[PDB]
């Protein structure tokens, strides 16, 4: 397995899957570094975020648990095809990059919060993370280049 990836079995079906403890991604297939990557993200903030406020809501009072439930709902919808990542980032992301469909542009190591940076650089091009926790809130990250 490449670094970051481990083998697991589904608790409901027993079937083997793979999970990445740096990005929190999980997938059924056995999976197998640049100066910069470009990512988009969708951030859902909660009451312990460093600044609990966004263009969506002046005072954010959801718990960290409620934020993760929202994140997991958006991941489901994106993986199902029912909604596009871009569409959910524009509507729901608690960051001003929502107005750019969640795009953050290209960045190097050194610029972003560290868990965000590590997950971004551990994703393959086109791959989406699972929930990624930072002091700003909980992210879904899409590596676009």
From Swiss-Prot:
The keyword Zinc-finger does not apply. Its EC number is 5.2.1.8. PROSITE patterns: PPIC_PPIASE_1, PPIC_PPIASE_2, WW_DOMAIN_1, WW_DOMAIN_2. CDD domains: WW. It comes from the Eukaryota. Changing residue 95 to A: Loss of peptidyl-prolyl cis/trans isomerase activity; decrease in DNA repair of double-strand breaks by homologous recombination slightly less efficient than that observed with wild-type protein. No effect on RBBP8/CtIP. Its main location: nucleus. One of its GO terms (biological process) is negative regulation of cell motility. Phosphorylation at Ser-53 by DAPK1 results in inhibition of its catalytic activity, nuclear localization, and its ability to induce centrosome amplification, chromosome instability and cell transformation. Ser-53 is dephosphorylated upon IL33-stimulation of dendritic cells. It catalyses: [protein]-peptidylproline (omega=180) = [protein]-peptidylproline (omega=0). InterPro entries: PPIase_dom_sf (IPR046357), PPIase_Pin1 (IPR051370), PPIase_PpiC (IPR000297), PPIase_PpiC_CS (IPR023058), WW_dom (IPR001202), WW_dom_sf (IPR036020). The WW domain is required for the interaction with STIL and KIF20B. This is Peptidyl-prolyl cis-trans isomerase NIMA-interacting 1. It comes from Homo sapiens (Human).
